Amino acid sequence: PHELESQFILRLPPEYASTVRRAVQSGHVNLKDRLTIELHPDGRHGIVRVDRVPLASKLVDLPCVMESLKTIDKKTFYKTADICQMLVSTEKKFIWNHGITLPLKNVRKRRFRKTAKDVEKEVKRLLSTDAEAVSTRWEIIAED
Template sequence: MEEQFILRVPPSVSERIERLFNENASSSEDGSLDLSFSEDGRSGTFMIGNERFPASLLDLPCIVESYKTYDDSVLIKTADIGQIITLREEGDPAPEGIEYKHGLTPPMRDARRRRFRREPDLNVLYLGATFVYDIFGSSHIFLHVQPELVQRVEKDLLNIMSGGTVESLHVEMVGPEAGGERKKDAPTPVAKPEDVPLEVATNGGGERERGDSDDSLEPES
């Protein structure tokens, strides 16, 4: 399986590596290249000729795709690169940690801080969860739904879908109060259609109350 890395070297070393690739290795002063890592897999030594340079393997802040071409027209992807090997001069300080904070291009400078979200602080999340739990615990709010309520709602929905009516319906009248608050009256149950009396209201003496609709039904003399 092919693995690729980005090799970032000082300018002086870059010129020597380019000259070694362009010239014959036997005729060049820098006849060989070698890279070895210690047991931790993060620090190592890069050798060019007889000179050694400290090397560090770091994780890039993003994935870089690698392509190759044979005809300068068609590009073929070869690998996803997520690590970089940096060389430094002897005596230069080693990088802190295993994460490289910069990308490969100038717009990606300090990309790990500017472009990516920080990891959440677990202590802050724990304090927030504890605060919410205390609120619900002090107000005696139960975080569960009664099965009877669910069954009643499901039954009402089925009745509505089949063309029926809701069995239990409550109407609340809300009126303004002196302090600007709204006061809720006691819920008044609505009678079912079958419970509505069919008799017409009478006017004291038992006779039907005559209205405009009754007069319109009498024949004209």
């Protein structure tokens, strides 16, 4: 079978980003030894090791949706993957408010329309507790 590839964006500190960029544009396999990525079983924490120097990482959710688009002639572009996550290196904490481009900053707060009426999972847990019970008493309340 075929499994859709999973692309994400890696953001590094600027000096380490310059060393990683120089090693990528060089093209040797020396970069392979220099750059490693260890993702912790939390799922939202990691180490990126640049030149064997550990950096602390967080995998965050991006507010917009990006899409990688490949081309052969630079006139027709084929969508290859959807990017929604970034492993910035240096829950509410795992949500990034800004977008990658310069015009998109504070997009989640300002350029996103918010419509409102985790919570569903809590309601399911409450229903399960009511089922495991015997007698349930309920009242919409006031200030108390």
